[PDB]
Design a protein around this ligand. Structure first.
Ligand SMILES: COc1cccc(NC(=O)Nc2ccc(S(N)(=O)=O)cc2)c1
Ligand SMILES: [Zn+2]
Length: 257
């Protein structure tokens, strides 16, 4: 089964998921000098005041904070998007060391980690139908650098002890994702894919320019999680990132001058 080891990591995925070598795969390097300001882009609209988190799950590749998406509560609109996209989960990708861990890079710079807030287009009715469409998903990507602590992240960090191994979950209500956003919503955007199998080409990527700062102690607790299940040999959950993929026939657009 796929993962991030030497025998099953990203260079192997194309054997079970041939779309891995496709025309709109993610992540990519963001070359800041080639991304063109697009004055037709609108400001992002992030409406998370009514978000309802339910649960946190270690799925063996990352941990997902899951939301109730049965009504239009926490939604992403505007920016490059047409229509309304509903928040379903967020998760992170991170490194074994502070010098790597993000999936997108900026002028080849790797950040310590990257947050993905995953939303689906309500015109397709459910997430499973949305991922079959080229405009089915919108993922908001936020870089993490190591410095000062992020207070709004600490409630996530403190529950990770209870979901150390694959398949463990814990109740996780009343978490406010507004506490994970940077001050500025300036962004880059391009058409891409899921960055894990099945690597479907269904995502409008919206990557914020401003990273958030987290503390060394916070990211250290990410790195104590396990890829393995309970009672299996311990394999630390680190370096769960896909490297940058070819840009091919795509343009990255900037919302800012
Ligand atoms: C309970 O919550 C669910 C329920 C059903 C599906 C999912 N998500 C999923 O299947 N895949 C996914 C999402 C984003 C990315 S990524 N790294 O490109 O942002 C990669 C893969 C979550
Ligand atoms: Zn992701």
């Amino acid at each position: 089964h796929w993962g991030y080891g030497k025998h099953n990591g990203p260079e192997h995925w194309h054997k079970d998921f041939p779309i891995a070598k496709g025309e709109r795969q993610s992540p990519v390097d963001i070359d800041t000098h080639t991304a063109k300001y697009d004055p037709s882009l609108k400001p992002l609209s992030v409406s998370y005041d009514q978000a309802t988190s339910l649960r946190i799950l270690n799925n063996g590749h990352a941990f997902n904070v899951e939301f109730d998406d049965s009504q239009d509560k926490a939604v992403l609109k505007g920016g490059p998007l047409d229509g309304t996209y509903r928040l379903i989960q967020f998760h992170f990708h991170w490194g074994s060391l502070d010098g790597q861990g993000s999936e997108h890079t900026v002028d080849k710079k790797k950040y310590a980690a990257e947050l993905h807030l995953v939303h689906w287009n309500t015109k397709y009715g459910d997430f499973g139908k949305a991922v079959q469409q080229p405009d089915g998903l919108a993922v908001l990507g936020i870089f993490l650098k190591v410095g000062s602590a992020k207070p709004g992240l600490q409630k996530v960090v403190d529950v990770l002890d209870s979901i150390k191994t694959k398949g463990k979950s814990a109740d996780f209500t009343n978490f406010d994702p507004r506490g994970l956003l940077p001050e500025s919503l300036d962004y880059w955007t391009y058409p891409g894919s899921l960055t894990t199998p099945p690597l479907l080409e269904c995502v409008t990527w919206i990557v914020l320019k401003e990273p958030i700062s987290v503390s060394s102690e916070q990211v250290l607790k990410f790195r104590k999680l396990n890829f393995n299940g309970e009672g299996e040999p311990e394999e630390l959950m680190v370096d769960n990132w896909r490297p940058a993929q070819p840009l091919k026939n795509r343009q990255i657009k900037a919302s800012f001058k």
